[PDB]
Write a protein that binds this ligand. Structure first.
Ligand code: Q2C
Ligand code: Q2C
Lengths: 237, 237
């Protein structure tokens, strides 16, 4: 390998223009967030990773951006999800009431983008960016999602819902973002119940009996939060 | 996390003095290598990782050191090993004929040490060093062993022996240094046979029938190298 050769795709083409345009469009769907200066938002985003080594990013790097993208969503209307992105977002696009992280400004900005800096320059690396597994874990994208997913989980309250893919071999994966960051940052003072919606892909079983679901229950119970689980048998309906 | 916070142990206490002393002692066990200037060897070693980000090390970083530690060992007398370090080295300490990588100068120098640089300084990081899995793969230690193990495998010829731990659940592990670097760098022009010695830990089975051993055979066969396997039932004897 050569210096700064990473295994992952490079920064999304036209990433600066895309983030700015997404901030502009979000400010229009959500009159609550028109107080946001989108050029300031982008500057803070760029400042989090530019000129920094893309294997050495910190949560504090994103703190200016978290401040400018601070957004109050009803803490009792949070939808977490794991490995069922399409249905989770179609669900909140109908409800319009419930919020996934991608329905917040910061999640919307970053959704499906990749980015990283060419260290020791002020330039964006369009050639490759670190892969979390093969290259390094503290890369600009992974650190961003770890930090905003933790803050999203920390803000939830009352009954927190999580949509899970029942057609998977690991319905609950302790190593996912949900299993490794979000579930452990639910605050028992604010959160009374974690309710899992296990979406079936035809499986007549009670997937709340699945061993990974029982594993999730044990994690939740040890945090002094109650657990609830429901089968959703016909995702269509 | 904070900047340069790694998950692995810091550089071995007194690492510079240890590497130098080990080079001195090796030059005395092996009159063949007294042409080696140990201060030059250490300077090259230090130069490979000092002032470089410990998540961005390259094979070329170690090329000055490889040159100064060039060592000819009989290519037909190589012993590779995986997960049976103690017996493999007791074997070559008796034989004195066969060489593991730790019996070469460079392997001897680094054996059981850890090291890394504080990036943007010329100082050694004694607090922590990247863990290959949790932090980043291209760290000074992992890159060193990947590079010297590849060159060791590239130099082998005729019948190459590999000692393996038959008491393990994965007798052959495709992800080990042996499985992922060494076996794929055996040169079919030089190497006629890879012979596995599967050491038993009381298991009367033919462990050459093990599925991971058959997996190894398939890898070796696809490289146009013959395969041989032997059970060693009484490691004591
Ligand atoms: C002891 O310390 C261990 C803690 O280390 C954490 C482990 C997770 C890691 N996060 C990401 C890393 C990453 O590199 N990229 C590109 C992401 C892109 C989008 C997102 C999003 C998260 N969320 C919220 O979290 C739940 C969904 O996320 P889930 O992971 O549960 O569901 P899944 O369908 O499996 O993933 C979806 C995408 O994310 C990628 N993905 C996941 N895991 C990855 C990993 N380990 N490596 C590389 N890709 C990873 C996957 O390839 C898919 O493109 C939801 O409730 C959201 O509220 C919405 S978007 C996350 C990442 C940060 C560091
Ligand atoms: C698609 O690209 C994938 C290629 O990526 C490679 C994967 C392997 C990695 N190598 C090391 C990484 C490392 O961070 N450190 C501290 C090492 C220390 C000593 C050595 C030595 C190798 N050898 C020759 O190789 C065979 C034995 O080695 P084996 O691995 O087969 O047997 P095992 O008993 O399991 O390991 C023994 C020690 O090495 C550590 N160990 C292994 N694997 C590791 C890993 N992935 N992460 C972190 N520790 C790892 C393990 O914790 C034990 O302390 C022999 O025939 C030698 O000739 C003699 S010393 C290697 C490393 C380099 C990058």
């Amino acid at each position: 390998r050569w210096r700064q050769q990473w295994s992952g795709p490079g920064t999304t083409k036209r990433f600066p223009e895309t983030v700015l345009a997404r901030c502009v469009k979000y400010t229009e769907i959500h009159p609550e967030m028109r107080h946001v200066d989108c050029q300031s938002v982008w500057d803070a985003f760029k400042g989090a990773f530019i000129s920094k080594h893309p294997c050495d990013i910190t949560e504090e790097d994103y703190q200016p951006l978290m401040k400018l993208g601070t957004q109050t969503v009803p803490c009792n209307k949070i939808l977490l999800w794991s490995r069922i992105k399409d249905l989770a977002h179609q669900f909140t696009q109908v409800q319009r009431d419930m919020f996934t992280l991608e329905d917040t400004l910061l999640g919307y900005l970053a959704d499906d983008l990749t980015w990283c800096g060419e260290f020791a320059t002020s330039k964006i690396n369009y050639q490759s960016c670190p892969d979390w597994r093969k290259d390094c874990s503290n890369n600009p994208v992974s650190v961003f999602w770890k930090t905003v997913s933790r803050r999203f989980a920390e803000a939830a309250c009352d009954v927190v819902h999580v949509m899970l893919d029942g057609s998977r071999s690991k319905i609950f994966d302790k190593d996912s973002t949900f299993g490794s960051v979000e579930v452990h940052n639910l605050q028992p003072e604010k959160v009374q119940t974690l309710e899992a919606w296990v979406i079936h892909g035809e499986d007549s079983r009670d997937l709340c009996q699945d061993p990974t679901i029982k594993e999730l229950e044990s994690i939740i119970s040890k945090r002094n939060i109650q657990f609830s689980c429901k089968n959703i048998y016909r995702p269509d309906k």
